[PDB]
Write a protein that binds this ligand. Structure first.
Ligand code: SF4
Ligand code: CA
Ligand code: CA
Ligand code: CA
Length: 350
DNA sequence: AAGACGTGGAC
DNA sequence: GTCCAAGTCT
């Protein structure tokens, strides 16, 4: 049916030739491949590079990561987004240490039982690190295959991914699955790009139904995103006389879990300074807002308003709250939105 | 199934 | 503005 060998040859030769020397490609420690694959979920290669370098310098092996304090691991992820990824990884390595004594399982089902490890990450890690011939279908590979085999199913359905997964097993080169899997990923990065794909340069120009029919720009097929809710948020930056600032740790469930923030209130309607004033009551005086700005998430947009305030100590500071010397805020992991809050507060203070 | 879950860069 | 970023949990 499908000229697998001729296809594989023009792909893998292209790949030994064009492969980028990325940091996590220096070797095949499963730990390092695994860390990189988690960081790369919904995140551009170029963004990941500096975080990977710093993360592995802090946590050079699996037990280092497991032994480390949740707070330390989260701070190393600060700014990357989708922070549940690193809680899942941390939990997952703790389990690989206790349960399996430090060795990354090479059994798919056992590896996949670990938190964070879905079908993509099973494929990527096991095919690169241990040679296991599982497909590693990322969003890019779904685009590639959609264009190659002219598969028009919505790639948002879980079922479509399962179809693409089966296709990969058929066309795969079981002689070297790691390189096969990498090469498809690399092809989507370097040639078969979301817009204006470089089909003329493409190595597998000859096997591409979409190019033949002239529709590469028309793929892949994906349901248009839903518009996201908007959420007004009042944020208090409260300083006492010695310059200390009040922060609090978000709970471990839901949005931006276990990250630190300046005390904040979702103000569906009005009464920002009021709804804020009452929440810290549950001794503070808040002045007029100093800035308003938006911050996007995938599924909502915060509309933040920052209110300065003076803190007067009439009691102890009870969890989740913490009294932080300004010079110590850098120790805590904050979301990018509250990083900006602080920046805006300090430039107003000038 | 399809919503929750961050952030940034290239059109 | 849109689409994607080497997805996964619920
Ligand atoms: S010929 Fe174009 S559309 Fe087909 S795989 Fe190559 S870059 Fe993608
Ligand atoms: Ca799994
Ligand atoms: Ca919660
Ligand atoms: Ca990709």
């Amino acid at each position: 049916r499908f000229p697998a060998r001729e296809f594989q040859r023009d792909l893998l030769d292209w790949f030994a030739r064009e492969r980028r020397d990325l940091p996590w490609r220096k070797d095949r420690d499963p730990y390092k491949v695994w860390v990189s694959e988690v960081m790369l979920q919904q995140t551009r290669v170029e963004t990941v590079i500096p975080y990977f370098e710093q993360f592995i310098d802090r946590f050079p092996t699996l037990e280092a990561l497991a032994d480390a304090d949740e707070d330390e691991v989260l701070k190393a992820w600060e700014g990357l987004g989708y922070y549940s990824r690193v809680r899942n990884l941390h939990a997952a390595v703790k389990e690989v240490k206790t349960r399996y004594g430090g060795k990354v399982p090479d059994d798919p089902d056992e590896f996949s039982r670990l938190k964070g490890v879905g079908p993509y990450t099973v494929g990527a890690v096991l095919s690169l690190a241990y040679g296991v011939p599982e497909p590693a279908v990322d969003g890019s590979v779904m685009r590639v295959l959609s264009r190659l085999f002219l598969v028009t199913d919505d790639i948002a359905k879980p079922s479509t991914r399962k179809r693409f997964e089966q296709i990969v097993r058929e066309i795969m080169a079981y002689e070297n699955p790691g390189a096969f899997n990498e090469a498809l990923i690399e092809l989507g990065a370097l040639v078969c790009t979301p817009r204006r794909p470089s089909c003329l340069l493409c190595p597998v120009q000859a096997y591409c139904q979409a190019f033949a029919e002239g529709v590469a720009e028309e793929l892949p097929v994906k349901m248009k995103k839903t518009a996201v809710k908007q959420v007004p948020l009042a944020v208090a930056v409260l300083a006492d006389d010695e310059g200390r600032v009040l922060i609090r740790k978000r709970d471990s469930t839901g949005l931006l879990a276990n990250l630190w923030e300046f005390p904040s209130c979702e103000t569906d309607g009005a009464d920002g300074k009021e709804k804020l004033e009452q929440m810290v009551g549950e001794q503070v005086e808040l002045t007029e807002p100093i800035v308003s700005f938006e911050h996007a998430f995938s599924h909502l947009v915060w509309q933040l308003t920052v209110f300065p305030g003076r803190l007067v100590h009439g009691g102890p500071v009870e969890e989740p709250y913490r009294l932080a010397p300004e010079d110590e805020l850098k120790a805590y992991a904050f979301p990018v939105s509250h990083q900006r809050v602080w920046r805006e507060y300090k430039e107003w203070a000038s």
